[PDB]
Amino acid sequence: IANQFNSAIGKIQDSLSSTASALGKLQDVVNQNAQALNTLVKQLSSNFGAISSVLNDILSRLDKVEAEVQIDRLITGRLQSLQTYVTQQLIRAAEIRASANLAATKMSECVLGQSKRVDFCGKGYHLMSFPQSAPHGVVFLHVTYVPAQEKNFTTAPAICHDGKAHFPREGVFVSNGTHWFVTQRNFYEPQIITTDNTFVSGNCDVVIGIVNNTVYDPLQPELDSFKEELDKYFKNHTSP
Amino acid sequence: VSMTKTSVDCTMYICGDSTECSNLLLQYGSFCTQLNRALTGIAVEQDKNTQEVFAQVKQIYKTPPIKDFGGFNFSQILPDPSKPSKRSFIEDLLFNKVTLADAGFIKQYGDCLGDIAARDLICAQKFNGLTVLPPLLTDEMIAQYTSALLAGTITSGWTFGAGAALQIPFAMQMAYRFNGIGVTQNVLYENQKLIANQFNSAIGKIQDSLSSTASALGKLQDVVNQNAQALNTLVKQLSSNFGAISSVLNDILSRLDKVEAEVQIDRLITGRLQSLQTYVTQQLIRAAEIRASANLAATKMSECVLGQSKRVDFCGKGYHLMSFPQSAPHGVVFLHVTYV
Amino acid sequence: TDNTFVSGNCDVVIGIVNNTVYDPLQPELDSFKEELDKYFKNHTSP
Amino acid sequence: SQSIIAYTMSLGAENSVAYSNNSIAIPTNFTISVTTEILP
Ligand SMILES: *[C@@H]1O[C@H](CO)[C@@H](O[C@@H]2O[C@H](CO)[C@@H](O[C@H]3O[C@H](CO)[C@@H](O)[C@H](O)[C@@H]3O)[C@H](O)[C@H]2NC(C)=O)[C@H](O)[C@H]1NC(C)=O
Ligand SMILES: *[C@@H]1O[C@H](CO)[C@@H](O[C@@H]2O[C@H](CO)[C@@H](O[C@H]3O[C@H](CO)[C@@H](O)[C@H](O)[C@@H]3O)[C@H](O)[C@H]2NC(C)=O)[C@H](O)[C@H]1NC(C)=O
Ligand SMILES: *[C@@H]1O[C@H](CO)[C@@H](O[C@@H]2O[C@H](CO)[C@@H](O[C@H]3O[C@H](CO)[C@@H](O)[C@H](O)[C@@H]3O)[C@H](O)[C@H]2NC(C)=O)[C@H](O)[C@H]1NC(C)=O
Ligand SMILES: *[C@@H]1O[C@H](CO)[C@@H](O[C@@H]2O[C@H](CO)[C@@H](O[C@H]3O[C@H](CO)[C@@H](O)[C@H](O)[C@@H]3O)[C@H](O)[C@H]2NC(C)=O)[C@H](O)[C@H]1NC(C)=O
Ligand SMILES: *[C@@H]1O[C@H](CO)[C@@H](O[C@@H]2O[C@H](CO)[C@@H](O[C@H]3O[C@H](CO)[C@@H](O)[C@H](O)[C@@H]3O)[C@H](O)[C@H]2NC(C)=O)[C@H](O)[C@H]1NC(C)=O
Ligand SMILES: *[C@@H]1O[C@H](CO[C@@H]2O[C@@H](C)[C@@H](O)[C@@H](O)[C@@H]2O)[C@@H](O[C@@H]2O[C@H](CO)[C@@H](O)[C@H](O)[C@H]2NC(C)=O)[C@H](O)[C@H]1NC(C)=O
Ligand SMILES: *[C@@H]1O[C@H](CO)[C@@H](O)[C@H](O)[C@H]1NC(C)=O
Ligand SMILES: *[C@@H]1O[C@H](CO)[C@@H](O)[C@H](O)[C@H]1NC(C)=O
Ligand SMILES: *[C@@H]1O[C@H](CO)[C@@H](O)[C@H](O)[C@H]1NC(C)=O
Ligand SMILES: *[C@@H]1O[C@H](CO)[C@@H](O)[C@H](O)[C@H]1NC(C)=O
């Protein structure tokens, strides 16, 4: 588990030393904010119907009443260019706020906790996440357990034994084809079916697909070998 | 999950092929490029939204030919091969409830000129430089993704969410669900025919209700209605004079000389440019509501379809057992199953 | 004693009630005491 | 020998899951995977 973590962290480092565009979500924000400012500077080139874009070339050429009609045209278009920029930035600020609120929720639930929420903290069953800072952003390195090398088994919902139906406490019943076990559900680790691994409910008539097997009572041989301890004392005490 | 993608030729809307108006529109600089960039950014995001929600499976899972799911009957929500799109029975019900306007799938002149040209708003939008663009995923591809989400769920439980799909019998998956709500698994196996009949009957009531009431998909119809009403508002703003002698740009150019027409055309450019800036701002504000809704639908897909949620009222009312996705026009329907 | 766990005495808990709590190992050893007893009684006969 | 090609996109590889009323798959092993999420 330690070598697999250490190797997976090595592949984060290798990818971030090899691919370019992976931080494209953060580069897109820098690109959009730069392109919006370049667009706003470029709108100063626009005449908006005036004799020039250059405010000094209006004032160097025209008297007070001719200039004021030309300057009004530049005020109108430049004021509209700011109202457009600020509306677009107010609309983008809400996308960045939603993204920061999500990142704060992943900091709480994936870094300060372990999440049961599917696909909230990477792909697999969440173990833990590590925050890393990035320009205008956060990176979460999410660690997950992914189950790897599955095998087919025969299964049953219940075992029938003493005319009683038995169910797993924790786990699932499985057969390799000849013998029956209980295993934990997320990792194959087979155990003999016992009155400690299982609980009883009702008789074998109700459950669709119940199978017959022995269910071991570990108190039984602890008193069966004790039943032979009494007999050897009784048979030795035939001697007097 | 999405809204209709729109593009505008800002020059065909404002100037409608007048070269005189086109020369005057260049004096406003970057605004028509900004408007096209903003609508292109909205349109790319409708495909993104649909990929966040529906493309949550690695593999296109198939159900087995032997439908032995322990007495639970999924036939109304599984694919039906008798149709060109392999949608479910409930997905065909859903696709009949919401009425669309333009899918983007080619309008080819003879279907739009002559006798049809009067009795249509879509040809009046298109003859003014306004176009709907098709989705990247077709409705058949969204139905294949939804088929794979449902086949993955009923054959393998939550395991296809975390890794490889691991098969488990359906009544044993349902016994896992029961443990996950704090009910012991013998309560499922001892009541299995009852739990199956209650599920089968509750799915029958979804079919009956969707066959009976009109306005249930009003959340999706409101989105189609808003996008259609915004495009009809934008087309109707071409009737406005904005203080010019006419709204008809050709009647200005037919009756006025070069210098008199420029003063009237600038008045129409000013108001038509403001009409596009209003439309694009309103559509940028809407696109954020649809995004937030698609991010919620993608989270419900991960946490209610690919898992069992412990979150209260996140996956229906009751204790969550499992959810089934169904595709709908620009949306998703979750059929949430709960223990009450 | 399989359905329940012990913690402390009955003085502390507000609203605790008296009932029997069954030990299922008890009759499994009492019937094993009666098994010993009939063996001892029978083996008095020689 | 390069050119631009146009195609209907694949949604994924197809998979018939091996479902049966009494078959289960259980993982005999695991992997630890580390995956990156980036947020503005
Ligand atoms: C299903 O799982 C069973 C338990 O793991 C397994 O049965 C076991 O098989 C091994 C041989 O492969 C036996 O091993 C013993 O063989 C003799 C017994 O006298 C000894 O000399 C050996 O030292 C060794 O202990 C086990 O005794 C046997 N266990 C039981 C409880 O029968 C099955 O073979 C598996 N079946 C399939 C289809 O894989
Ligand atoms: C699982 O184990 C059960 C207990 O050993 C076993 O139940 C027994 O099944 C047989 C055949 O159905 C019955 O045999 C008797 O059936 C009637 C009288 O009941 C007579 O006509 C027959 O000649 C014969 O005597 C047993 O009565 C029945 N026992 C009980 C307690 O119900 C199951 O058959 C086993 N199932 C499997 C799949 O292995
Ligand atoms: C799963 O639920 C399905 C919906 O209730 C159900 O499908 C329905 O089944 C009945 C009986 O086969 C069909 O009834 C028709 O049967 C034949 C068809 O040729 C006619 O002669 C009859 O007069 C009658 O109309 C329904 O048409 C059918 N409905 C649909 C929408 O397919 C399944 O049978 C259920 N599956 C199981 C395993 O019980
Ligand atoms: C629950 O069961 C308890 C055990 O049987 C029982 O406790 C006993 O309560 C009585 C009455 O309070 C006490 O009786 C004696 O009280 C003093 C000496 O302690 C004498 O003056 C009395 O004459 C009498 O002998 C018991 O001593 C006490 N036993 C213990 C171990 O504390 C509770 O009363 C029962 N409660 C209910 C609600 O049923
Ligand atoms: C569970 O899966 C593990 C992989 O995630 C696997 O560990 C890997 O086991 C093989 C040997 O079976 C190792 O291969 C090396 O073995 C020796 C050196 O020790 C050399 O002869 C080989 O050429 C090769 O270098 C892998 O290194 C090892 N991987 C890790 C991360 O340790 C387990 O064996 C699997 N366990 C079970 C019970 O299935
Ligand atoms: C689990 O079993 C399935 C199918 O059931 C098996 O069918 C036999 C082939 C045999 O293995 C029996 O013990 C089982 O009852 C396996 O699915 C097959 O996979 C191969 C590719 O590896 C494919 O060519 C077949 O068409 C598949 N058959 C079916 C019916 O799906 C599957 O590989 C097994 N899975 C694991 C994890 O071992
Ligand atoms: C499982 O399906 C088989 C047919 O393949 C059938 O004979 C058997 O009765 C079914 N068992 C259960 C538990 O449903
Ligand atoms: C009885 O058995 C014990 C061992 O169990 C032995 O030491 C002793 O000698 C035996 N005595 C008789 C009388 O058999
Ligand atoms: C419960 O309320 C009754 C009065 O109705 C009171 O006599 C009793 O002591 C209370 N018991 C507990 C456990 O609080
Ligand atoms: C009593 O003990 C004798 C041996 O002395 C034995 O043969 C017999 O089976 C025993 N019977 C009982 C009922 O214990």
Swiss-Prot record, chain B:
Site (Cleavage): R87, S88
Coiled-coil residue spans: 221-265
Record region (Fusion peptide 1): 88-109
Listed result of changing F160L: In strain: Eta/B.1.525
Listed result of changing T299I: In strain: Gamma/P.1
Residues carrying covalently attached carbohydrate according to the record: N73
Variant or mutagenesis effect after changing D222N: In strain: Delta/B.1.617.2, Mu/B.1.621
Region (Disordered): 100-125
Region of interest (Heptad repeat 1), ranges: 192-242
Region of interest (Fusion peptide 2), ranges: 107-127
Effect of N241K: In strain: Omicron/BA.1, Omicron/BA.2, Omicron/BA.2.12.1, Omicron/BA.2.75, Omicron/BA.4, Omicron/BA.5, Omicron/BQ.1.1, Omicron/XBB.1.5, Omicron/EG.5.1
Disulfide bonds: C10-C32, C15-C21, C112-C123, C304-C315
Function: Precursor of the fusion protein processed in the biosynthesis of the S protein and the formation of virus particle. Mediates fusion of the virion and cellular membranes by functioning as a class I viral fusion protein. Contains two viral fusion peptides that are unmasked after cleavage. The S2/S2' cleavage occurs during virus entry at the cell membrane by host TMPRSS2 or during endocytosis by host CSTL.
Protein known as: Spike protein S2
Species: Severe acute respiratory syndrome coronavirus 2
Phylogenetic lineage: Viruses, Riboviria, Orthornavirae, Pisuviricota, Pisoniviricetes
Protein encoded by which gene: S
Curated annotation (Swiss-Prot), chain C:
Glycosylation site list: N18, N42
Task performed by this protein: Subunit of the fusion protein that is processed upon entry into the host cell. Mediates fusion of the virion and cellular membranes by functioning as a class I viral fusion protein. Contains a viral fusion peptide that is unmasked after S2 cleavage. This cleavage can occur at the cell membrane by host TMPRSS2 or during endocytosis by host CSTL. In either case, this triggers an extensive and irreversible conformational change that leads to fusion of the viral envelope with the cellular cytoplasmic membrane, releasing viral genomic RNA into the host cell cytoplasm.
Protein name: Spike protein S2'
Species this chain originates from: Severe acute respiratory syndrome coronavirus 2
Originating gene: S
Range of the intact protein held here: 1117 to 1162 of 1273
Curated annotation (Swiss-Prot), chain D:
Glycosylation site residues: N21, N29
Record annotation: effect of changing S16L: In strain: Omicron/BA.2.12.1
Superkingdom field: Viruses
Organism: Severe acute respiratory syndrome coronavirus 2
Main function: Precursor of the fusion protein processed in the biosynthesis of the S protein and the formation of virus particle. Mediates fusion of the virion and cellular membranes by functioning as a class I viral fusion protein. Contains two viral fusion peptides that are unmasked after cleavage. The S2/S2' cleavage occurs during virus entry at the cell membrane by host TMPRSS2 or during endocytosis by host CSTL.
Protein's recorded name: Spike protein S2
